[PDB]
Design a protein around this ligand. Structure first.
Ligand SMILES: CCCCNC(=O)c1cc(S(N)(=O)=O)c(Cl)cc1Cl
Ligand SMILES: [Zn+2]
Length: 258
């Protein structure tokens, strides 16, 4: 099964998911001089209920905070989106080195990590699973993490990491004030892309925030102690879980600001 190790990593994903070589793949290089400001984009409008988070788990590929998506308690609206997109899950990507961990790269700068907030178009589709298969099904908000002061908003997450060391482990996790983790500016870049993990479906409106949040090196290192292996499988660590950048293939990256 897919992963980020030598034989199962990003270069080999095309073997089992041919869409890996598609024309709308993520993540990408954002070359700001080629970004087009678009005055018709709208501001992001976010409502995240801290009661929505229910469980944090080790998927074997990152941690995954799952949110109850029974109705519209937590939503993303506005930005490049038509209609309201419902919060599903949050996870994080990193690398083995603090200066090369993010999936999106900005003028060649890789950040230390990148947080993904995954939402689905409930205004048009009846479930996450159905939305994940449509070009306007999903919206992911991307937040960069840069090395700096320790971030107290990440303490809730890092305190659970020991309890979810092995793949498949999970721990109840609620009252997570995700709003308060975001940067204070919500200026963004946007482009049509894909899931950055298998099955790599081309169903994602990416909304990448310009402003990074901080994390300390010691906070970030905790994530690398997660395993990509389950209880009673020979241990291997998830030291890096970011996909390389993919060809832009004539897509337009637009900016909400100038
Ligand atoms: C345990 C299931 C496998 C893990 N899958 C993901 O974490 C995932 C990632 C993105 S990403 N990296 O594109 O934001 C999206 Cl859009 C949707 C999903 Cl479902
Ligand atoms: Zn992701």
């Amino acid at each position: 099964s897919w992963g980020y190790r030598e034989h199962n990593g990003p270069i080999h994903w095309k073997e089992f998911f041919p869409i890996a070589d598609g024309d709308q793949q993520s993540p990408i290089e954002i070359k700001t001089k080629e970004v087009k400001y678009d005055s018709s984009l709208r501001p992001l409008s976010i409502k995240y209920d801290p009661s929505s988070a229910k469980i944090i788990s080790n998927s074997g590929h990152s941690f995954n905070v799952d949110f109850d998506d029974t109705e519209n308690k937590s939503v993303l609206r506005g930005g490049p989106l038509t209609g309201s997109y419902r919060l599903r899950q949050v996870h994080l990507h990193w690398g083995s080195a603090d200066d090369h961990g993010s999936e999106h790269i900005v003028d060649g700068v890789s950040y230390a990590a990148e947080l993904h907030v995954v939402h689905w178009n409930s205004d048009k589709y009846p479930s996450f699973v159905e939305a994940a298969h449509e070009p306007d099904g999903l919206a992911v908000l991307g937040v960069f993490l840069q090395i700096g002061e320790p971030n107290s908003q990440l303490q809730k997450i890092t305190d659970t990491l020991d309890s979810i060391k092995e793949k498949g482990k999970q721990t109840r996790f609620t009252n997570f004030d995700l709003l308060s983790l975001l940067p204070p500016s919500w200026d963004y870049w946007t482009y049509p892309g894909s899931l950055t993990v298998p099955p790599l479906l081309e169903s994602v409106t990416w909304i990448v925030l310009k402003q990074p949040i901080n994390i300390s090196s010691q906070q970030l290192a905790k994530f690398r102690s997660l395993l990509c292996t389950a209880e009673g499988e020979a241990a291997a660590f998830l030291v890096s879980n970011h996909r390389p950048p993919q060809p832009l293939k004539g897509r337009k990256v637009r900016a909400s600001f100038h």
